[PDB]
């Protein structure tokens, strides 16, 4: 199945020129930690309207 046929290269495309300047690097600046709101917020009946 994986044999290579002799068909000519047409519609050929070129890409991925390995320009060193194209490199960019990671961002981690959003380092603030939002701790858990695990506290029990169960309701207290005082609010209940008349």
């Amino acid at each position: 199945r994986k044999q290579e046929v002799p068909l000519p290269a047409v519609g050929v495309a070129v890409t991925g020129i390995p320009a060193i300047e194209r490199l960019r690097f990671k961002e981690v600046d959003d380092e603030a930690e939002q701790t858990l709101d695990l506290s029990n917020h169960a309701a207290d009946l005082t609010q209940i309207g008349d």
Binding site: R1, K2, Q3, E4, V5, P6, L7, P8, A9, V10, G11, V12, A13, V14, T15, G16
Partner: protein, 195 residues
């Protein structure tokens, strides 16, 4: 002071190199820009040992490896061309797609680029050659993998919501009767050897 190629020419040629081909029906302004200075773009590609082709009636410009002095062994060895060589499964799907494409072209000549087909039509064809693994989903995945590879070669649009695809006109110049006959001779040789 320093000479600079026309900005639009540079844009069009760089994009055309990026995508290896270009259709008037989808990006008309770049197509016409190239057609305004075909000598210029051919000149630009010349150092790369790359070249240009034209199909006015189909509105397609496609790059092609220059062969004036490159080794006849294979243009695929050319360093810049990135996507790897074609393989005979892809070639089988190419043959089926070419048949569908010529059938479409009969209906309205060259017409538009809208050579539409339903994926459910391809699976019956492949099942004959690649066989039947007995799981419709498995064969669908196999066909989609092959179609993805072909789209990597730029011969087919990616699937869509209606499970339809449209054959890129570039196929007419890969399945060129000359190429077809060269392949056919090679494959006849292969079978003869297979004994």
């Amino acid at each position: 002071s320093e000479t600079r190629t026309l900005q639009k020419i540079r844009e069009a040629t760089q994009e055309l190199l990026k995508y290896g081909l270009l259709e008037e029906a989808s990006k008309p302004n770049l197509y016409r820009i190239v057609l305004s200075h075909p000598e210029e773009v051919t000149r630009i590609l010349e150092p790369l040992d790359l070249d240009i082709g034209i199909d006015e009636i189909r509105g397609l410009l496609y790059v092609k490896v220059r062969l004036d002095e490159t080794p006849a062994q294979d243009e695929w060895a050319h360093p810049l061309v990135r996507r790897q060589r074609l393989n005979l499964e892809q070639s089988l799907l190419v043959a089926i797609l070419r048949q569908h494409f010529v059938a479409w072209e009969q209906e309205s000549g060259t017409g538009a680029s809208q050579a539409q087909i339903a994926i459910d039509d391809l699976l019956p064809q492949l099942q004959i050659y690649l066989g039947d693994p007995g799981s419709e989903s498995k064969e669908r995945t196999r066909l989609l993998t092959l179609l993805d590879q072909l789209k990597g070669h730029g011969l087919v649009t990616s699937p869509d919501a209606h499970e339809r695809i449209v054959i890129r006109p570039i196929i007419a110049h890969l399945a060129d009767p000359i190429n077809l006959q060269a392949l056919l001779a090679w494959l006849r040789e292969q079978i003869a050897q297979q004994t």
